[PDB]
Structure formats: structure tokens, C-alpha cells
Design a protein around this ligand. Structure first.
Ligand SMILES: [Zn+2]
Lengths: 84, 154, 53, 119, 50, 125, 71, 52
RNA sequence: AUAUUGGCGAGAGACCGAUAGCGAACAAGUACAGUGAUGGAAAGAUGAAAAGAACUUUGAAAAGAGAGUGAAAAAGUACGUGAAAUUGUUGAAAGGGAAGGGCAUUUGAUCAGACA
RNA sequence: GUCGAAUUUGGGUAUAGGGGCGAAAGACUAAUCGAACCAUCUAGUAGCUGGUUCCUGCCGAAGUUUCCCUCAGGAUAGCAG
RNA sequence: CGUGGAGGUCAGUGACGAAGCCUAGACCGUAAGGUCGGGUCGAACGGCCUCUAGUGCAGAUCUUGGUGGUAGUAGCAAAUAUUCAAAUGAGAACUUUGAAGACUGAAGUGGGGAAAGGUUCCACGUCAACAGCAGUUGGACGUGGGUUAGUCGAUCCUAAGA
RNA sequence: CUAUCUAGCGAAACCACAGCCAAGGGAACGGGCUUGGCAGAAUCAGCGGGGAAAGAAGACCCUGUUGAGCUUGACUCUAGU
């Protein structure tokens, strides 16, 4: 049987957790991930997947440093001590 | 907590209620119509004879292909059943309406169950698993119950 | 005993029981929603073999 | 509520470094009483007090290393300016204001003069 | 498995801490639209794919 | 009418700039008028409300009930007054959430940085 | 864990995740001024680390637990 | 929005199934997967002649 | 001078008003499905204020009946108004292998106003 | 039916779409194979099928001529408003 | 004729109840539809002259949501089989103990493990849901506890190969 | 062991409205129309005559200025050599 009796032989994973995007896409035999190619330098992104860039672009995360750059521009990238 | 079309006065009445009870709707309806209009001392005697398999509950509306029996003769029907979960939930409200007619001061010697109706509660879903990988519903049919006993005036 | 942790921080022993019984029902209507709406397009397969003739 | 940073700039380096250990001793005893008493709200202030010490310790060592590199040609990349990467690779206001010796002789002889139209 | 790696034991320990109902003092705040813990997993229903 | 292009006449932009105001822009939102003695004594129309001001109610069903500001609950945009309350059927006496606009200030909790505040609003001693 | 304090000389601590059985044997020497026979270590299923340090036959575990203050 | 209703990747099921020939969202495990798309009769679809 | 459906900050509308408008007014690219690329929802409104029903009594309990709060529980966290399908009680009437409809009147019910 | 072998099988690894692999059936390639799955161009095109939302008033047809890879369709003349 | 919005006007209606909804109650119009009484209900909405359109549904094996008849019906029938007393309990064919009766029968219904799952292990509470009958029991719900290495594995080395 | 009867639990396909015939005419094989035969509530277990029963925009045939697999000395090219 190709259905229910052959779904019982599925106990060996072929993808594991990626280390740079943290989702089960890192293919073990190829040794490359498939949502963003992890041993590659640049992340995998395509303009035919316009929706699949909404889930991953700039803004879906903490933005630990970039969220302050717009405030630091307004004051003008000043430095030094503050005030009275 | 409003009730059905009770055409009696509230001053000599006492009422009870159950909501979202997980009895069958189609059996608690025919239980509630077996005792409609009766005296309270004779409905309580009758409803526990049902549990001892004498004097069945006459099924009138929801009675398609149920089995025929001989205990339906006293009602003039040939199809009757003895629903046990239904009478245990109607007995639990006749005992609650006969406890509110003591706290209101009425006499339990001449009460009669005047208005009694059931309704349909929101169903409770489950799944059943059919052949060739299909999924189908498996729902409960719960029921609200309202009940009003009243002193027999003239 | 973490039972007193409730009793100092809002919740009472009684308020937990009537609160969880509402809460365990607030998940009951939602799972009754999920079974009802999905039950139409859940038998809708793709590659059925038709073992006849 | 315990310490206050204006009363910690004054205290010298070895006075802070022994005050910080005295706060870590008090903090560790408070995580024992929390195991036996359900609420313990004092443990917020002791945990914000070793942060107030540590920001005063680091305040002094950044300052003392800055006058150690004062006026030198190269200071570390922790004391230079965190302007954006595009600004640091850009020309300085002397380098941008460099003109050739021919374009400098022209600006002193034929400058842009201002004028009007009526007489 | 039994002989497991550390970066799945670090993941099933987070799922242990997230296997908690709503705290009951949450439902008492001013504008509290939350009423139950809707991201709540159970090992019978939903396998986590880690 | 509106004349600068920095102010909005939008409904939605002005209710989002009210319901999500931070807890110090809610300080001026909860101002309260002074009675017709302090307006002759000091010389302001309104001050931002503060805890432990003695106050009087001019609107509502609790009209003409003196009290004292017990807590400025500037999260529900409400203030609470003690010596008036609501006796529950359980026996608890919860206080009432008033709004600072429906009050009037009778005795003022003077202070530094409020003595100076009245002076910059042209007030007196 | 009280059974390990009272029967044996085993003090049980929750240690930080980056400690490595020399930083625990030396911590209990520096914090509590005792001697440690042997440190054992497991990583609890709530993702924290638990260390069964063991005092050595002349230091007593009840006296150290009482000086700390968890009896 | 010119991409309103055209976010989904819906392909019509065909005719051998006993349901209409509108494009239908594919997948499973959500309530949406199976529903119609891309039309103006559909819920979640376009409008007819989107305003320009 | 020019381009700008991304970023940041503003102003606006003969635009949509929760099956609409972005997929998302809400812990929404969230839950969930797939080995994987990818697919991807549903889900807004008690009241001005929780004053979210103390107490009594029947029940093993949920609950019920009173009582009480409220302008109103014909607003009681299943909470604005709450349509239809479909359902229950009560009231009227009809009924020999369908029901319904058209013209005409008897009978019952019901409604009526210039002169009223 | 075969049951000591052209045996059965675990794990590792190799080959990926006009490509793989085939003791060869067009078989198998994740319930998909005489060319997988996913997203996009894409709202592909259709002389073909179904549907096409209020009332009243007045007038009211055609299946015929000619040409067309024309015959389930058009252009043109006709009738009609 | 009707509808969503726009300019104008009626110094229009409205918490002494606007819109909605219900009504084998009334009236007008050939009709599309308009007006009124009653009930409900609680915050906005109309007439008229013009402007504008995402403007009128019985159908599309229409779309989404909801509900029916069928129907208390089909059925809940493989894996040999259960019974007595007691205890707990509001409640016992089903939970616990005891007494019987039996089965798997050492390629086990036994004891362990590799994949895979991930807290299911274990105790104390508890039965709204789930366990397609039941439930006092539970792999369920609620709160916690629990996995200890110089020798056991990884780590180390190479295989086909990357 | 089912079916059957009871306690508990409790779905689905399908459904314009529905359900007694004979002849007639009719889209040329009516449950309804027309003329007759007639006809008494509610129903239970069977049963396979009928409902041109249900299943799926006929898999055969034809039409399409609709495709695809494959073949060769079809037309137009092409890697390679
Ligand atoms: Zn990745």
C-alpha cells in the first residue's frame, strides 16, 4: 500500500533547525537550509515570493539598533554631556 | 430569566428552570409532555414508575421507527419508551419547583404542573471518523427546560 | 506552597474556581467553532483513487 | 531607593568595589527569603542598586581611559563617535573644502559680487 | 529521543514553561481584552516540529 | 478655525492622541477649575489636579459634595474623592470615579513647583 | 532536596548555566568557607542547572544550611 | 489596493469534484484552505472593476 | 527642474465601516497544515460606573427561586439592538393518496370613518 | 508463492524535473507521474457552458441574401427602435 | 420607485425616545413602494431641489456563515469472559481491595532499548470538556516534584561520500 | 455474532415541491395535466418493482481554427560533431 501502510515508515527527519533563522528548514544531507540559504552569505529571497518577504524583512523583529537611528538623526548624531 | 407563554397568575405559582442540560432534546420533550397539566403528587409518582419499567413515556412527535410496546395502551398510543436520563432531569426540577412553592407559602397538596416546555440548547461538537478518510459531526442535543407549578384555584 | 501566592496577589480561592470554569468554557466555544466551520472543507481530498470499475 | 548615583560619583574606586560586593551579599540573602516568603518587593531595589553601582564604576573607567588617549592620533573604537558608517567614511570639512590652486586664484580675482537692477 | 542534543533540550524546556494557563490576575486589569491563553499546546493534539 | 498646518482636525487622530496619551500628558488633560474665590485670590481659571486637594463637585448626582482628592487615577482618566463613596451591598465602600472637569477646587495643596507654577500663569500669593 | 541535606552532606544549589564544576567547587569554597568533596551536575527540564555539591565529613550540611537560612 | 484579493495562490479544483469551478485556496489545517478566492462573488475576493 | 506602491515625520478625503477596508481594527504573517519551498485563518461593542448579584432557601454540585445593584438584567461577563431559516409551550382553525394559488360568496374573527 | 539466496532489512550516502532511476509496468520519484510539488508571469485564452439584481408605459423582430479554413462564429443587406 | 454618500433648503424630527426590528392592525399608489398605530429598543435621522456611484437578487454543481428533513434512524457486532462481596461516593456493568473464573503461553499481552515523541514519568487536588456507553478512574484538567558519570554514550578516527 | 426490543450515545448520502393507479395526449415511457378507477388517523419488521434512485459537466462518438504523450523522408530550426 502507498498510503496508510507507507505512512508508518516515516521516522527519519530530513530537515532540522537552521542556525541563522531558527526554523526547521536546514536540510541535513545537502548541508544547506532552504528558507534562507545558511552556508551562503546572502539570505535567500525571491521577488516571486512577495509574501515570503513580508514574513522575514526588516521590521518583523526587535530591531535592536535600527529603531533608534531615526531619533538620533533628528538631534543630529550629537555626542557629549546633556545639560544642567 | 423570562418564561414561556404562561397564561396563569404569578401570585399562586412557583417556577423552576434548567439550562444547557446535556440530556437529549427529543426525549426530554416527550417526557415534559407526558406530565403536562398533571397534579404534582401524581406526576412525581408516575415519573418514577417509568424508571421501574411500568407506565412508559408516550412518544408522539419524535417516534420514527422506535419499537412498539404494550405499556403505551393507557395513553392511546403504540410507541412508547422509558427514557432514564430524561426523567432524572425532570424529577430534579419538579423537586425544585415543589421546594419553591413551600418557600412562597403555597400548599403542595393542590399544586399542578401547569406550564412546562423544553427548548434547544447550543449543541456541543465532536468528531466521528468515517470510511475513506472522512470527518463528520457527532453532536450533543442539549435542552433548556422551564417548568411552572400552580395552586389549583377555581 | 504556591497556593498562598494566589491569595496575596488578587485572586481568591473561590474566584479561581469560577474564573477557571468560565475560562475552561471560553476555550470550549472556540473549539466548537473550529470543529463546525472546518467540517465542510475537511473531507475535500485531492487524489482519491475510486476503487470501482 | 537604596543608593543614589550622585552619592556614588564622589566615592573612590576601592570604596565602590567593596560596596558592590556588599550589595551582592544582600541580594543573595534575599533570594533565600524569597524561597520561604511568597512576595518580596525589596529585591527590586537591591537589583537596581548593583546596576547603579556598575554604571558608576564603568563611568569612571571610561573617563580615565579617555584622558589617557587624549590628544593621541588614534583612540579605541569604543571611544570614537558612533555616527553611521556612511558618515565616518565621508570627507571631512577640510577635505571637502580643498580646491585647486587654479580654482583658488579665480575666486579671489572674480568672485560672485552682489548687485541689483535699478539706478 | 532519549540521547538528545542540547538545542532540542533547550527547546522542549521553553515549551515546558509555556505550557501554562492564563494567570488569573490578568483578567482583572482595566482594558483587558485577553480571556484565555490561546497559544497553549498539548502533546496529544499538536506536535511541535523542532 | 484651524490655521496652522501642524494641528489636525481629524476625529481618529485626535482620539488616538487621547486614549494613548502617556501618564504625564494626562496631567494637563485632568485639569480642574478653581472656585470663584481662588480665581479672585490667585487669578487662574484652572490648575492640573493633584492628590490631597480639597475639592467640590458641581455636576452629576453627587452635586455639591465637598471632599478631598484621595488619588488621581490618571489611567482611567478619573479622579477619586474621599469622604464620599458608594456603600456596596456586601458592606464594602468603594470610591467614585469622578472626572476633574466636573469638580471645582476650594482649598489648594500649596507646594513648591506649584507656587512657582501659579506665578507663571500670572497668579498671586 | 532536604533529604540530601539531612542524610548526606549534600548541599543542593541552582547554579548558573555557564558553570563547569570547578567554578562551583571554588564558589562554595569562597562563599561558604567550607571544603567540597565532589560536585555533580544535571540540567533540569525547566532549562536550569542543578548542582549537588557535597561537603566532606567534618563540615556538616545542617550547619551550613542554617547559617544560610533555609533550615 | 491593487493587490486586494490577489494575495492568495488559488487554483480552481476542476470539474471532477462536486463543487463549483471558482478558484479555491489550497492547503489544509486552517479553515480558509478550501474556500473560494479571486472573484467578486467570493468573500475575501476582489471587487468588480476595482476603482482606479 | 525630474522619479519615488520602501523608510521617517506631517496634513487631508463626495473613500470602506467588521462576509467591507490591507491577509490582519483583537497576543496577525498569530494559531494551524506541509518533510520542504511555501500555504495561512477565524476573532470588535455589558454599563455612565462593576455598583460582576452580599444574604435566605431547595440541591451532592452546576444551578434554581427569592432578595439585591441599576435609568434598564426585555443589559448578568453564553453580556448593545438580537432579523430569518429552524424549534418549544400556549391560542385559533383545517385535514379520506400531498400542500399552496385565481374568481365569487356563506360563516367566524377583526378593523373602520365624511353624515360621526 | 518463496524461505540460505539474483535473500530480507536498519542507519549513512549518491543521482532532482524534459531530469533522476528502471530484471522494462510508462513503472517509481512523499495518498501527485504518457513529465512532481511550490510561488510567480496570470484576473493566461475561449467562436464553448452556466448566471446576469426595480416597476409601469409605448413601439416590436429574426433564423434570409452575399463573402469568410465559413458550417455552435463573424462582416454585409434585410426586418426593428 | 428604492439605496450608500455630496452641495442647498425645511431656523425639519429626536432621551417627553432617533435608527432598527416585529405586527392573518389601518391607509394611499396600476405597480416599484410610500405613510400611520401598537410592541420592542436606546442616539442619532429624515422631506424637498440637485450632484455622485462599489446602488436594487431566487437561481450561477455561486461565495462565506447559519440551520433543517432524513433521525432518536444507520449503527456503537474481529482480537474466547466475565462473576460475587466490601470500601469510597450524591451517584458504581465500568474505580480500589479481597475472593473466584480465565487468557497472552518464553518469535508473550513479559522485561529492555534505537528512531520518533517531549514531561506523557510521579505525587496531591479535581470531573466543565475529552476517554464515539459510564466515571468517583485517566496518557484529561489544576498545582508541583523529578533525570546526578574520571569508566555509560557523544566528543576522537576513518568508510561510501560531502 | 448481528438484525430485533430496551438504557446511554448518535452521524451520512440524498432532497424543486413531493409521493395510489389505468389509458390518453405530450420532448414520441407522468407522482402532478385530462377522463376514469377511487380514497380513512398513526404506524412496526422485512423487501428490492418503481422513484428513467444515488455516485462523476460521458471515460465511447462527433464538434473545437482547444491541448499533450509518441513517431517519421511533414514544415521551420537546433546542441553536437
Ligand atoms: Zn534558514
Amino acid at each position: 500500500g502507498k498510503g496508510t501502510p507507507s505512512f508508518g515508515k516515516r521516522h527519519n527527519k530530513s530537515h532540522t533547525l537552521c542556525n541563522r533563522c531558527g526554523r526547521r528548514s536546514f536540510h541535513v544531507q545537502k548541508k544547506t537550509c532552504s528558507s534562507c540559504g545558511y552556508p551562503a552569505a546572502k539570505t535567500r529571497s525571491y521577488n516571486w515570493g512577495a509574501k515570503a518577504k513580508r514574513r522575514h524583512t526588516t521590521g518583523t523583529g526587535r530591531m535592536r539598533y535600527l529603531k533608534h537611528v531615526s531619533r538620533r538623526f533628528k538631534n543630529g548624531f550629537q555626542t557629549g554631556s546633556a545639560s544642567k | 430569566a423570562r418564561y414561556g407563554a404562561t397564561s396563569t397568575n404569578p401570585a399562586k405559582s412557583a417556577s423552576a428552570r434548567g439550562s444547557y442540560l446535556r440530556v437529549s432534546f427529543k426525549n426530554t420533550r416527550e417526557t415534559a409532555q407526558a406530565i403536562n397539566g398533571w397534579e404534582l403528587t401524581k406526576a412525581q409518582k408516575y415519573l418514577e414508575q417509568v424508571l421501574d419499567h411500568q407506565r412508559a413515556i408516550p412518544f408522539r412527535r419524535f417516534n420514527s421507527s422506535i419499537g412498539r410496546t404494550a405499556q403505551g395502551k393507557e395513553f392511546g398510543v403504540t410507541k412508547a419508551r422509558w427514557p432514564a436520563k430524561s426523567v432524572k432531569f425532570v424529577q430534579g426540577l419538579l423537586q425544585n419547583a415543589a421546594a419553591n412553592a413551600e418557600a412562597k407559602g403555597l400548599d403542595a397538596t393542590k399544586l399542578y404542573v401547569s406550564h412546562i416546555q423544553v427548548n434547544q440548547a447550543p449543541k456541543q461538537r465532536r468528531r466521528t471518523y468515517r470510511a475513506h478518510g472522512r470527518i463528520n459531526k457527532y453532536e450533543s442535543s442539549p435542552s433548556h427546560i422551564e417548568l411552572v407549578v400552580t395552586e389549583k384555584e377555581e | 506552597t504556591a497556593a498562598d501566592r494566589r491569595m496575596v496577589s488578587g485572586v481568591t480561592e473561590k474566584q479561581y474556581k469560577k474564573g477557571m470554569k468560565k475560562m475552561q468554557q471560553l476555550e470550549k466555544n472556540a473549539i466548537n467553532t473550529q470543529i463546525r466551520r472546518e467540517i465542510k472543507r475537511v473531507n475535500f481530498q485531492t487524489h482519491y483513487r475510486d476503487e470501482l470499475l | 531607593a537604596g543608593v543614589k548615583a550622585y552619592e556614588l560619583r564622589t566615592k573612590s574606586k576601592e570604596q565602590l568595589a567593596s560596596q558592590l560586593v556588599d550589595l551582592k551579599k544582600e541580594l543573595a540573602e534575599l533570594k533565600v527569603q524569597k524561597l520561604s516568603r511568597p512576595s518580596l518587593p525589596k529585591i527590586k531595589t537591591v537589583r537596581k542598586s548593583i546596576a547603579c553601582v556598575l554604571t558608576v564604576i564603568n563611568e569612571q573607567q571610561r573617563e580615565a581611559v579617555r584622558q589617557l588617549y587624549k590628544g593621541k592620533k588614534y583612540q579605541p573604537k569604543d571611544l570614537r563617535a558612533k555616527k553611521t558608517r556612511a558618515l565616518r567614511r565621508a570627507l571631512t570639512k577640510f577635505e571637502a573644502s580643498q580646491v585647486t590652486e587654479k580654482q583658488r586664484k579665480k575666486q579671489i580675482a572674480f568672485p560672485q559680487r552682489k548687485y541689483a537692477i535699478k539706478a | 529521543a532519549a540521547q538528545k542534543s542540547f538545542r532540542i533540550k533547550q527547546k522542549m524546556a521553553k515549551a515546558k514553561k509555556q505550557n501554562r494557563p492564563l494567570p488569573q490576575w490578568i483578567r482583572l486589569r482595566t482594558n483587558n481584552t485577553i480571556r484565555y491563553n490561546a497559544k497553549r499546546r498539548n502533546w496529544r493534539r499538536t506536535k511541535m516540529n523542532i | 478655525a484651524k490655521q496652522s498646518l501642524d494641528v489636525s482636525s481629524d476625529r481618529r487622530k485626535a482620539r488616538k492622541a487621547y486614549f494613548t496619551a502617556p501618564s504625564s500628558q494626562r496631567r494637563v488633560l485632568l485639569s480642574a477649575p478653581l472656585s470663584k474665590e481662588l480665581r479672585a485670590q490667585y487669578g487662574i481659571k484652572a490648575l492640573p489636579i493633584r492628590r490631597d486637594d480639597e475639592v467640590l463637585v458641581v455636576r452629576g448626582s453627587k452635586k455639591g459634595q465637598e471632599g478631598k482628592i484621595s488619588s488621581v487615577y490618571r489611567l482611567k482618566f478619573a479622579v477619586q474623592v474621599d469622604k464620599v463613596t458608594k456603600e456596596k451591598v456586601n458592606g464594602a465602600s468603594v470610591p467614585i470615579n469622578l472626572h476633574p472637569s466636573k469638580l471645582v477646587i476650594t482649598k489648594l495643596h500649596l507646594d513648591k513647583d506649584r507656587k512657582a507654577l501659579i506665578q507663571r500663569k500670572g497668579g498671586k500669593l | 532536596a532536604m533529604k540530601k541535606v539531612e542524610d548526606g552532606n549534600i548541599l543542593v544549589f541552582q547554579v548558573s548555566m555557564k558553570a563547569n564544576k570547578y567554578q562551583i567547587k571554588k564558589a562554595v569554597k569562597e562563599l561558604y568557607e567550607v571544603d567540597v568533596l565532589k560536585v555533580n551536575t544535571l540540567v533540569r527540564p525547566n532549562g536550569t542547572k542543578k548542582a549537588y555539591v557535597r561537603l566532606t565529613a567534618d563540615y556538616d550540611a545542617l550547619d551550613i544550611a542554617n547559617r544560610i537560612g533555609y533550615i | 489596493s491593487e493587490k486586494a484579493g490577489h494575495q492568495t495562490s488559488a487554483e480552481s479544483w476542476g470539474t471532477g469534484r462536486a463543487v463549483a469551478r471558482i478558484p479555491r485556496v489550497g492547503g489544509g489545517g486552517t479553515g480558509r484552505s478550501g474556500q473560494g478566492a479571486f472573484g467578486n462573488m467570493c468573500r475575501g475576493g476582489r471587487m468588480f472593476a476595482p476603482t482606479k
